[PDB]
Design a protein around this ligand. Structure first.
Ligand SMILES: [Zn+2]
Ligand SMILES: [Zn+2]
Length: 95
């Protein structure tokens, strides 16, 4: 019974400011990407970057990161700190 055209509000671009290290291209440029959901971004730097348990060396790469490289002692511990950058929520059971 409703009458009227809809028009969802524009979407934002979370983007992934993940400046890898030694990346094929140079100088060390930002990962480069465009997401719409906060879940994607957080899920991006997770596997896309941090990768799964089959990755070699896990470091938090970002344009404005405190560790500016300083890795962690555990794989998860990484994705946990990454959140602070992605802008999403915190990590479950933080050690
Ligand atoms: Zn990325
Ligand atoms: Zn960081």
């Amino acid at each position: 019974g409703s009458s009227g055209s809809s028009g969802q509000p524009i979407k934002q671009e979370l983007s992934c400011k993940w400046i890898d290290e030694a990346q094929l291209s140079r100088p060390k440029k930002s990962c480069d990407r465009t997401f719409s959901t906060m879940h994607e971004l957080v899920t991006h730097v997770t596997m896309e970057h941090v990768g799964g348990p089959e990755q070699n060396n896990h470091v938090c790469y970002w344009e404005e990161c405190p560790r500016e490289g300083k890795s962690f002692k555990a794989k998860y511990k990484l994705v946990n700190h990454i959140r602070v950058h992605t802008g999403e929520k915190s990590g479950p059971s933080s050690g």
